Amino acid sequence: SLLMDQAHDSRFRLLKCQNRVIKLSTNPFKKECVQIITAVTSLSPLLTFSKFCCTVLLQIMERESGNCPKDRYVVCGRVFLSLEDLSTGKYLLTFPKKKPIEHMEDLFALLAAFHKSCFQITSPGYALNSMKVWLLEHMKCEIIKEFPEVYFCERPGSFYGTLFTWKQRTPFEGILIIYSRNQTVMFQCLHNLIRILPINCFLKNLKSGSENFLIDNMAFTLEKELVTLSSLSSAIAKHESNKVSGALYREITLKVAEVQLKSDFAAQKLSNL
């Protein structure tokens, strides 16, 4: 989150920030991955004194613990920005010419500021490689060396400055992520992509994760629930040898409920798609 300096802004209005997390694997081909958090916000309301200062506050909250015990706030430095600073570049990414991305904060400011849309692709009765041609010859991509899972399209048409990614898991099926500067371009892109693919290549949008992963999640949740209920019955069954303590029944039903909420979570994720 982002806090403005009160002494500057006598007038109180709001402030916003959208948090996008970005996982990028670095040379998976352990092997260092990179998780980085990023917020995003409007400039022009802040620059109304030509200069502003913002503190940067990074909260961490636990899920496992329902006690709200752990709020490890952090204060991660302080940003100052003035209109002289912008007048001379110094911070800007402005397209053409600052193409050869060799300061990865440039890549990440893209992946954060750009609308994101995920799509699963399936070709059941045809192996699938024509994506890599649509990418490497049609769109004229540049691979970022540091992160070879990301492709920046340089084709100087209307979709200038759009980023993909492409995980080709099980080479029938694949998954493609589109970072774009509006939604008109994202439709202009999907149209061109559908045009290249085979006739049987079935696209699908993804809101909330890959079908295989959400099935694994649903499986895991059911497995833990059923194991825990077998544990309830085994607690009864050893008490059959020893009429039951309702206290034990309550104690076990609590943990069963605590797992059921997860199975119901996985179930809604699966049952919307």
Partner 1 sequence: IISKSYKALINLVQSEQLVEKIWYRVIDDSLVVGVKTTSSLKLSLNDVTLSLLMDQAHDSRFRLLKCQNRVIKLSTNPFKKECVQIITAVTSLSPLLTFSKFCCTVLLQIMERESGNCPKDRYVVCGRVFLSLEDLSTGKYLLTFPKKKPIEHMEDLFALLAAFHKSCFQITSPGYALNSMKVWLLEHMKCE
Partner 2 sequence: REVAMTDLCPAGPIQAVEIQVESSSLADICRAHHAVVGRMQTMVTEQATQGSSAPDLRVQYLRQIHANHETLLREVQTLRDRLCTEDEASSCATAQRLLQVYRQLRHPSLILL
Partner 3 sequence: LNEAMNVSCALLSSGTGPRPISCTTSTTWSRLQTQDVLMATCVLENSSSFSLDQGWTLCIQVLTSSCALDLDSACSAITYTIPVDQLGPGARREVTLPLGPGENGGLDLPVTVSCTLFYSLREVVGGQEGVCLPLSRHTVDMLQCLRFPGLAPPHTRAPSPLGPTRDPVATFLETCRELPPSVASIKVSA
The entry of partner 2, partner 3, partner 1, none that residue 33 binds, CB within 5 to 8 Å by partner kind: none
Apex CA 15: angle with CA 13 and CA 18, to 5°?
165
**Smallest distance, Å, CB 99 to partner 3?**
25
Q: Output 116 or 224, the one with its CB closest to partner 1.
A: 116
Other beta carbons less than 10 A from residue 142's beta carbon: 13
| Residue 19 in contact with partner 1, rule: CB under 8 A | no
- Cα separation, 121 vs 204, in Å, equals 6
Please identify which residue in 20, 132, 138, 181 interacts with partner 1, judged by CB under 8 A: 181
The entry of partner 1, partner 3, partner 2, none that residue 192 binds, CB within 5 to 8 Å by partner kind: partner 1
Q: Output 86 or 273, the one with its CB closest to partner 3.
A: 273
Query: Residues 160-189 vs partner 2: string with x where CB under 8 A?
Result: ----------x-xx----------------
What are the residues binding partner 3 (CB under 8 A)? 1-7, 9, 12-23, 39, 55, 57, 59, 61, 63, 68, 71, 73, 75, 115-118, 175, 177, 187, 190-191, 194, 202-210, 213-214, 265, 268-269
Q: Output 89 or 208, the one with its CB closest to partner 3.
A: 208
**Smallest distance, Å, CB 56 to partner 3?**
11
- Cα separation, 258 vs 221, in Å, equals 11
Quote the strand ranges of 132-171, DSSP E.
141-143, 150-153, 163-167
Asked whether the CA dihedral 87, 2, 38, 182 is positive or negative, the reply is: negative
What Cα–Cα distance (Å) separates residue 144 from each residue in 66, 104, 148, 214?
42, 9, 6, 30
Are 99 and 154 spatial neighbours (Cβ–Cβ below 8 Å)? yes
Please identify which residue in 130, 188, 253, 263 interacts with partner 1, judged by CB under 8 A: 188
Q: Select from 77, 37, 28 the least CA-distant residue to 57.
A: 77
- Binders of partner 1 in range 138-167 (CB under 8 A): 157-158
| Strand, coil or helix: 244 | coil
- Binders of partner 2 in range 191-220 (CB under 8 A): 211-212, 215-216, 218-219
Residue where the block lists tokens 């506050």: 57
What burial class does residue 193 get, using C-beta atoms within 10 Å of its C-beta: 0-12 exposed, 13-18 middle, 19+ buried? buried
- Cα separation, 96 vs 76, in Å, equals 32
Are 228 and 256 spatial neighbours (Cβ–Cβ below 8 Å)? yes
Interface residues with partner 1 (CB under 8 A) are 96, 157-158, 181-185, 187-188, 191-192
Interface residues with partner 2 (CB under 8 A) are 170, 172-173, 211-212, 215-216, 218-219, 222-223, 225-227, 229-230, 232-234, 236-237, 239-240, 243-247, 249-250, 253-254, 256-258, 260-261, 263-265, 267-268, 270-272
